[PDB]
Ligand SMILES: CC(=O)O[C@H]1CC(C)(C)C(=C=C/C(C)=C/C=C/C(C)=C/C=C/C=C(C)/C=C/C=C(\C)C(=O)C[C@@]23O[C@]2(C)C[C@@H](O)CC3(C)C)[C@](C)(O)C1
Ligand SMILES: CC(=O)O[C@H]1CC(C)(C)C(=C=C/C(C)=C/C=C/C(C)=C/C=C/C=C(C)/C=C/C=C(\C)C(=O)C[C@@]23O[C@]2(C)C[C@@H](O)CC3(C)C)[C@](C)(O)C1
């Protein structure tokens with residue numbers, strides 16, 4: 001059973017809809033607001049995560065198309081062939097650059113991404129922190145801290161966290177955080193349509 | 202609707218014609234139901250035939266003009282200059298089956314008394330509004346756009362306007378069946394309908410009612 | 413279960429369709445036994461057929477696409493590219509006879525009065541639970557897992573979730589008994605399922621003929 005103020009009904013979805021945009025309101029033709037609280041939370045977090053990934057992908061696409069490559073060597077230290085980020089850039093456009101990336105580099109990147117995914121999904125970590133799983137009444141999008149000294153801390157200390165490593169939010173006001181969440185949802189949708197547009201082009 | 206109400210309704214449809222029932226089908230008990238049931242069934246049959254005939258008149262014109270969408274591949278690939286019947290017969294068999302099976306589901310939904318009773322209506326024979334297609338609230342997944350009036354232009358209409366509209370529906374469908382069947386007859390036996398002879402109803406050499 | 417219970421079950425499976433027995437199997441007394449036991453047998457039959465047909469649908473998709481086990485010789489012996497019905501006919505008959513006898517041992521285990529009443533349930537015809545399968549607690553020898561949930565999942569499931577799952581089981585079984593037979597009918601009768609034309613490979617043999625050589629006339633041995 002849900003025990004939080006997280007949205008669990010079409011009324012709350014409509015409230016958040018007018019909050020993010022008074023004009024559109026709730027645009028739900030498929031009627032996936034007519035679902036259980038757990039599914040509503042799942043859809044909320046899915047939207048948020050697509051926003052994160054789409055924004056990151058769009059900014060990466062812009063930087064890679066501009067051609068601001070890295071100055072290092074990507075391989076060739078532990079007795080392997082030498083490949084440079086300049087070579088990766090000269091491979092082609094962003095999809096071609098990803099294709100030109102070596103296979104274990106891809107595997108390690110995807111592994112770190114999955115590590116962050118599971119640190120998000122781990123209910124015990126959120127409850128050691130101040131949250132629960134987004135399906136069972138948790139805030140959609142909260143990343144638990146990777147730096148900690150609790151029993152749920154890594155064997156070796158981690159320096160910083162994923163979100164807010166140096167407190168750029170610092171103390172944003174108790175509701176301007178929600179304002180930024182609204183702006184984030186809108187910008188995530190915009191970046192979603194944008195990145196699919198660039199990929200289609 | 203009782204038979205007195207049927208005579209009344211015929212008078213509203215046309216004050217001059219009245220209750221022209223040369224076969225007296227209204228005075229009958231089909232499958233041993235009541236006379237009110239027979240009236241409801243005949244009313245639904247007339248409304249449904251008029252509806253399908255009105256849509257079929259529009260479809261026959263639209264096909265005869267070779268008006269096809271600018272986004273579809275099937276129609277654009279299909280041969281042009283065909284009659285509407287030839288066009289339907291050369292449509293893919295899977296497409297025909299999807300059309301007929303969706304029509305089957307719509308018929309099942311219309312007949313389903315559970316859905317009508319959840320919406321405050323009944324089956325037409327058992328006493329209810331003939332021609333009322335229920336909404337899609339009871340569906341397993343929540344679709345948008347109920348069939349009748351999907352965008353909601355008649356939500357605020359008045360009962361008198363709606364009664365006038367139902368009378369118009371019956372009469373306009375009555376001549377719509379005649380029009381569509383005129384097209385089919387002229388594509389079949391030539392000279393059946395004189396007036397269309399100039400426009401060149403595209404000849405068809407098959408029995409339409411044999412898929 | 414009573415016919416009122418069947419009506420309630422049907423109205424919970426599909427509120428609109430409701431109780432839709434048009435042949436009155438629910439009313440015909442099977443073997444002279446009461447309606448409450450004919451209902452049990454018929455409901456167990458529905459559940460069992462749906463189970464076997466769901467498994468058969470997944471298995472037919474697996475066999476037609478030749479996703480075979482990597483470390484067995486029988487699968488290697490069977491030629492590749494055959495129709496899924498033929499992937500059954502190309503097997504040693506001794507393996508068919510052991511699949512069938514495995515189901516026989518399992519369905520002897522299921523209907524056993526002693527095992528059912530030891531675990532707490534009764535026979536499906538004796539007012540028990542239709543579609544239940546007792547675990548191997550009273551087995552002569554130990555065995556690692558049961559059939560239903562060999563692992564632990566759903567050992568702590570609510571009765572509401574179990575009821576929902578049984579309803580979904582019946583409905584998906586009703587649908588899979590038609591999907592699998594759509595595959596078989598399109599294989600052995602082209603243009604029978606209009607939507608699978610050119611999808612299901614054709615087949616000539618009889619899907620209701622398990623063994624190549626007729627067991628009733630001339631079997632084969634190994
Ligand atoms: C005075 C006199 O003479 O009689 C008296 C006695 C009598 C006879 C008893 C009386 C009566 C009753 C009458 C006259 C009843 C008439 C009934 C009638 C005439 C009923 C038609 C239905 C048509 C339908 C449903 C068409 C569907 C059509 C469909 C779905 C299509 O074919 C679609 C399609 O075509 C398109 C659009 C485009 C093509 O690409 C493809 C095809 C071909 C597939 C009266 C009233 O008392 C008058
Ligand atoms: C054309 C072509 O090439 O392919 C086609 C054809 C082909 C291959 C055939 C196909 C197939 C599969 C099909 C059609 C399979 C059909 C299977 C079917 C129909 C199987 C019945 C079993 C009955 C049993 C076990 C009876 C037990 C009987 C018993 C034990 C009784 O006591 C009966 C009972 O009455 C008494 C004696 C007394 C009563 O008081 C009680 C009852 C009523 C219980 C496909 C997929 O369509 C493809």
Ligand SMILES: CC(=O)O[C@H]1CC(C)(C)C(=C=C/C(C)=C/C=C/C(C)=C/C=C/C=C(C)/C=C/C=C(\C)C(=O)C[C@@]23O[C@]2(C)C[C@@H](O)CC3(C)C)[C@](C)(O)C1
Nearest residue numbers: 481482483484547548549550551552553554555556557558
């Ligand atoms: C593609 C390829 O080539 O991959 C290579 C990869 C790699 C890694 C190099 C290779 C390897 C090594 C592998 C994979 C090794 C696997 C080893 C493994 C899996 C070893 C099990 C031991 C089990 C025993 C001894 C059982 C005792 C059994 C006992 C004591 C029992 O009585 C069991 C039982 O009590 C229960 C449990 C419950 C009771 O109810 C029933 C009974 C009484 C019967 C291979 C082979 O080269 C293949």
Ligand SMILES: CC(=O)O[C@H]1CC(C)(C)C(=C=C/C(C)=C/C=C/C(C)=C/C=C/C=C(C)/C=C/C=C(\C)C(=O)C[C@@]23O[C@]2(C)C[C@@H](O)CC3(C)C)[C@](C)(O)C1
Nearest residue numbers: 466467469470566577584587588590591594595605606607
């Ligand atoms: C021709 C035309 O016009 O139309 C049609 C004709 C035709 C042929 C019908 C067509 C088709 C295809 C159809 C309709 C196919 C249907 C197939 C079907 C219906 C297949 C179900 C499988 C279910 C399984 C294996 C379930 C396992 C479930 C298991 C083992 C579970 O774990 C259950 C579970 O409860 C537990 C125990 C624990 C809980 O935690 C919850 C879960 C869920 C995990 C076409 C091609 O589309 C076109």
Ligand code: KC2
Nearest residue numbers: 052053055056140141142143162163177180181183184187
């Ligand atoms: C690279 C990916 C990425 C991008 C491009 C991106 C962009 C923006 C923008 C756009 C300009 C705004 C305005 C914005 C705002 C907020 N982000 Mg966000 N963000 C990304 C990633 C994460 C992660 C991992 C988390 C997170 C969060 C929050 C919180 C909540 C703070 C709180 O109240 O704790 C707020 C207000 C955390 C959270 O709790 O989300 C529910 C969290 O874990 N973000 N974010």
Ligand code: KC2
Nearest residue numbers: 252253255256331332333334349362363366367369370373
């Ligand atoms: C292709 C099919 C089709 C055609 C070509 C067609 C043509 C006409 C014309 C001709 C010029 C008029 C004037 C007219 C008028 C009305 N139609 Mg109608 N109609 C079609 C289909 C349906 C369906 C599915 C429904 C429906 C209805 C109504 C109501 C509502 C009354 C009320 O709400 O009381 C009114 C007034 C609904 C209803 O209740 O019908 C009993 C309903 O469900 N119609 N309709």
Ligand code: KC2
Nearest residue numbers: 443453516517519520521522523524525526534535537538
């Ligand atoms: C493997 C072969 C096998 C087959 C092919 C087969 C077929 C049929 C048919 C099909 C025509 C019917 C209709 C039927 C019905 C019942 N079977 Mg049966 N059955 C088999 C095996 C066992 C075993 C091992 C037991 C058993 C039982 C029962 C009971 C429970 C009554 C109760 O306890 O109230 C009922 C009603 C249990 C029992 O009571 O046996 C004394 C029991 O132990 N069956 N059985």
Ligand code: KC2
Nearest residue numbers: 463464466467542543544545560573574577578580581584
């Ligand atoms: C290959 C065969 C097979 C398939 C494909 C299949 C599919 C589905 C689906 C489909 C989407 C659902 C949703 C579903 C749900 C449930 N199944 Mg099921 N099932 C299969 C086999 C068995 C066996 C052997 C048993 C069983 C059971 C249950 C229970 C427990 C209820 C309870 O404990 O009250 C629930 C909720 C056990 C039982 O007792 O069922 C009364 C049991 O023994 N199932 N099952």
Ligand SMILES: CC1=C(C#C/C(C)=C/C=C/C(C)=C/C=C/C=C(C)/C=C/C=C(C)/C=C/[C@@]23O[C@]2(C)C[C@@H](O)CC3(C)C)C(C)(C)C[C@H](O)C1
Nearest residue numbers: 077078079108112146147158159160161162163164165166
């Ligand atoms: C084995 C061997 C040899 C060897 C070797 C050796 C010693 C190899 C060692 C390899 C080693 C040790 C490789 C580390 C990589 C670390 C990476 C990529 C870190 C990324 C770090 C990232 C992306 C961090 C991100 C964040 O931190 C940010 C920016 C802020 C925080 O808030 C959040 C997190 C934490 C996410 C010889 C001696 C040569 C001989 C022979 O060959 C055999």
